[PDB]
Amino acid sequence: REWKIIDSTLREGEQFEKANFSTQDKVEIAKALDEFGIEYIEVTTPVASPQSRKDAEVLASLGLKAKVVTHIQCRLDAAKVAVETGVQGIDLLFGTSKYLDIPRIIEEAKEVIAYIREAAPHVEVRFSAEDTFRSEEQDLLAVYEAVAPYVDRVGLADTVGVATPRQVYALVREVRRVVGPRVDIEFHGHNDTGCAIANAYEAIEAGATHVDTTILGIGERNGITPLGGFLARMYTLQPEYVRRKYKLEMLPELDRMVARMVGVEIPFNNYITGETAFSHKAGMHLKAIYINPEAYEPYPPEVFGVKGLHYGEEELHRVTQHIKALADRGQLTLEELDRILREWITA
Amino acid sequence: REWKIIDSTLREGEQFEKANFSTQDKVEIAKALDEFGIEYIEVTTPVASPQSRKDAEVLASLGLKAKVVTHIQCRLDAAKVAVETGVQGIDLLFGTSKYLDIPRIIEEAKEVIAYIREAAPHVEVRFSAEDTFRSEEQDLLAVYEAVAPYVDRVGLADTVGVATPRQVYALVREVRRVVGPRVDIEFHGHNDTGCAIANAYEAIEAGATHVDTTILGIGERNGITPLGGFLARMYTLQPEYVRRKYKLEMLPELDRMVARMVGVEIPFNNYITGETAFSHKAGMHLKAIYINPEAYEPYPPEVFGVKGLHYGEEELHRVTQHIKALADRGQLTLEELDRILREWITA
Ligand SMILES: N[C@@H](CCCC[NH3+])C(=O)O
Ligand SMILES: N[C@@H](CCCC[NH3+])C(=O)O
Ligand SMILES: [Co+2]
Ligand SMILES: [Co+2]
Numbered sequence: 001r002e003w004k005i006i007d008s009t010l011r012e013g014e015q016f017e018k019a020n021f022s023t024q025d026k027v028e029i030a031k032a033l034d035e036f037g038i039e040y041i042e043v044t045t046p047v048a049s050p051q052s053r054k055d056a057e058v059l060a061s062l063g064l065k066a067k068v069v070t071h072i073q074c075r076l077d078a079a080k081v082a083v084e085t086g087v088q089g090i091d092l093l094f095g096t097s098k099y100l101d102i103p104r105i106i107e108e109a110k111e112v113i114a115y116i117r118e119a120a121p122h123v124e125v126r127f128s129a130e131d132t133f134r135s136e137e138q139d140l141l142a143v144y145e146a147v148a149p150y151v152d153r154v155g156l157a158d159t160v161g162v163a164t165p166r167q168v169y170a171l172v173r174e175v176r177r178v179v180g181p182r183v184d185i186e187f188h189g190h191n192d193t194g195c196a197i198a199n200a201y202e203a204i205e206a207g208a209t210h211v212d213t214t215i216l217g218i219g220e221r222n223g224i225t226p227l228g229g230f231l232a233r234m235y236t237l238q239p240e241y242v243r244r245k246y247k248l249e250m251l252p253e254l255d256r257m258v259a260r261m262v263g264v265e266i267p268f269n270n271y272i273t274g275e276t277a278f279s280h281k282a283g284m285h286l287k288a289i290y291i292n293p294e295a296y297e298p299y300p301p302e303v304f305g306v307k308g309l310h311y312g313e314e315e316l317h318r319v320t321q322h323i324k325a326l327a328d329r330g331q332l333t334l335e336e337l338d339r340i341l342r343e344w345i346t347a
Numbered sequence: 348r349e350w351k352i353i354d355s356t357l358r359e360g361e362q363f364e365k366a367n368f369s370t371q372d373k374v375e376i377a378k379a380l381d382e383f384g385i386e387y388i389e390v391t392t393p394v395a396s397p398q399s400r401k402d403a404e405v406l407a408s409l410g411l412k413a414k415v416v417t418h419i420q421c422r423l424d425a426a427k428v429a430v431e432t433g434v435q436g437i438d439l440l441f442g443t444s445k446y447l448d449i450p451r452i453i454e455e456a457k458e459v460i461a462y463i464r465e466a467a468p469h470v471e472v473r474f475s476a477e478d479t480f481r482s483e484e485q486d487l488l489a490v491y492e493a494v495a496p497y498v499d500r501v502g503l504a505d506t507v508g509v510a511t512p513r514q515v516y517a518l519v520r521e522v523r524r525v526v527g528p529r530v531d532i533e534f535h536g537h538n539d540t541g542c543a544i545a546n547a548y549e550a551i552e553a554g555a556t557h558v559d560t561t562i563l564g565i566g567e568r569n570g571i572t573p574l575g576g577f578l579a580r581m582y583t584l585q586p587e588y589v590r591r592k593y594k595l596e597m598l599p600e601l602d603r604m605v606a607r608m609v610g611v612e613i614p615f616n617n618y619i620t621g622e623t624a625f626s627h628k629a630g631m632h633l634k635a636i637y638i639n640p641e642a643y644e645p646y647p648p649e650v651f652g653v654k655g656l657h658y659g660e661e662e663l664h665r666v667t668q669h670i671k672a673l674a675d676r677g678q679l680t681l682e683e684l685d686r687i688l689r690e691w692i693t694a
Pocket of ligand 3: 012157188190219220224
């Protein structure tokens with residue numbers, strides 16, 4: 001299974017009690033996420049406020065590799081503002097939750113999608129359900145199946161943080177059946193019941209292609225799938241893939257940056273970067289206690305920076321230039337060379 | 348599904364880097380867990396060290412309601428020491444992990460079980476696999492099925508913290524098939540891939556009856572299923588059951604007690620008791636952002652203390668005496684009256 005991350009530090013993260021990111025803070029965060037290799041960066045909807053709009057505009061025009069995306073309600077005026085910011089993708093939200101008129105939902109959606117398709121044909125269109133896991137699946141599938149021919153991606157969002165891993169798996173398989181071969185599936189999961197990482201994993205197991213994370217899991221309440229924890233989960237299953245696509249050794253810089261900005265300490269037990277993530281009580285690994293004589297190690301700390309014509313000339317040019325650039329910055333490490341070259345040499 | 352908690356703060360928690368509990372600390376912890384309503388309290392094997400043995404003896408003879416249990420390797424000399432401490436249950440460990448002679452395992456097990464059955468017939472016998480989720484299931488099931496007629500409970504332990512929720516579910520269903528109607532199933536899960544709570548939940552979904560937790564999830568590395576997080580997960584699914592069986596309003600006292608003893612701060616985002624567990628950025632719940640006009644709430648903070656002959660005379664006697672005792676201590680709250688009386692009045 002292949003998959004991509006949608007970072008939400010500048011969307012979900014702004015809901016975190018202590019977050020108040022300046023435009024400079026956001027640029028710093030986005031540049032670091034881009035260097036890390038994150039594929040998508042979602043920002044708070046530009047219709048939220050003048051500053052949300054200004055920040056979306058700045059971030060979308062930074063020339064990042066990562067695609068800068070946003071979200072809107074199903075309103076033509078919101079769509080208009082979002083397109084104007086220059087974002088590369090727009091997620092349209094709907095809700096059918098028991099805790100909240102399907103024909104209206106579908107019609108308003110198609111109207112807005114039609115507008116975006118015409119005004120900005122290059123922009124990704126996504127369509128997602130707020131409070132997915134308190135909504136009746138037949139209502140969800142009805143809406144997804146109606147909109148799927150016209151969108152690039154559909155989204156499931158466990159807004160309230162109650163979904164169980166096997167519910168996420170089941171519903172993702174159902175959505176895949178209904179949207180067909182082309183349409184991708186994104187998952188956004190809150191952590192109120194301790195399932196955000198497990199749910200993100202199970203969505204991928206079931207065929208989802210995109211997962212939302214934030215650095216340190218910051219977000220509304222106890223937040224969403226944390227970047228570090230999610231990477232740990234995926235690294236144990238696909239280590240070569242994960243280590244190739246992301247600069248895992250910079251994880252501690254990302255955690256520290258955000259911790260400093262929002263004024264928290266990294267949790268004592270935080271995935272990977274927490275003080276005790278790799279340690280145990282000296283003297284307590286006793287043969288009377290454990291069968292295996294070694295203290296177990298799920299992954300190594302250093303991986304996460306913790307103490308006839310011819311073809312291929314374009315890639316050769318890019319690769320050699322990139323390696324040279326790293327060398328001249330004093331940043332050419334064995335980790336970098338591995339991730340740059342493994343796909344060319346090994347088979 | 349009904350189920351019980353095995354607290355492991357005095358077994359798994361002793362592996363936590365910063366833990367060094369005195370005998371007094373352990374008594375304080377065990378008394379608080381007993382008041383909270385935890386069913387089982389597991390202590391480090393008495394064969395580990397003179398102090399482990401002394402502490403097991405003290406805890407097992409405190410007259411707690413909770414059952415004090417321990418673990419051993421499959422050795423007659425270990426079994427002997429464990430029985431002598433007066434513990435009410437003994438878990439025998441085996442390992443078949445790919446990362447570590449089945450006939451030997453089974454024979455040594457039956458020898459030790461036989462000894463315990465004869466020497467202490469009242470003691471619960473449990474039988475558990477170290478590093479369960481890196482072991483071949485056919486090896487596991489072979490051992491479980493051979494020992495099950497003679498034990499009270501079998502255990503699965505994700506020692507290395509790599510199991511996925513659907514693996515836990517599948518293997519638990521398989522174990523249930525093999526051990527039959529009488530034998531219970533316990534689950535112990537590490538959190539290295541962020542799945543400890545989700546895995547504990549899925550084990551229960553599949554038929555498991557016991558789950559290990561520690562306060563704040565302290566333990567080796569980033570620890571195991573945390574008490575608070577697990578209770579949150581279960582409360583959202585079975586709120587009446589959970590609120591009846593445990594004094595949920597004392598959760599903050601338990602988290603604070605352990606945090607103080609081991610010298611950590613409660614994580615900013617800790618389940619229930621963390622600073623931001625219930626909060627969000629003031630002003631950021633915008634109608635432009637969320638469809639639902641209210642900021643979502645998975646459970647209420649106050650629930651967890653966060654800001655012809657006749658029959659039934661014996662229970663009437665116990666209930667009236669208990670309510671009177673609470674009143675005279677100044678501890679008779681509406682929460683207490685609810686959990687004491689709901690099972691008598693409602694139907
Ligand atoms: N924070 C929003 C995210 C929605 C994601 C939709 N792609 C929620 O929890 O509902
Ligand atoms: N801390 C031990 C617990 C074993 C539990 C067996 N009932 C482990 O992770 O393997
Ligand atoms: Co959210
Ligand atoms: Co353990």
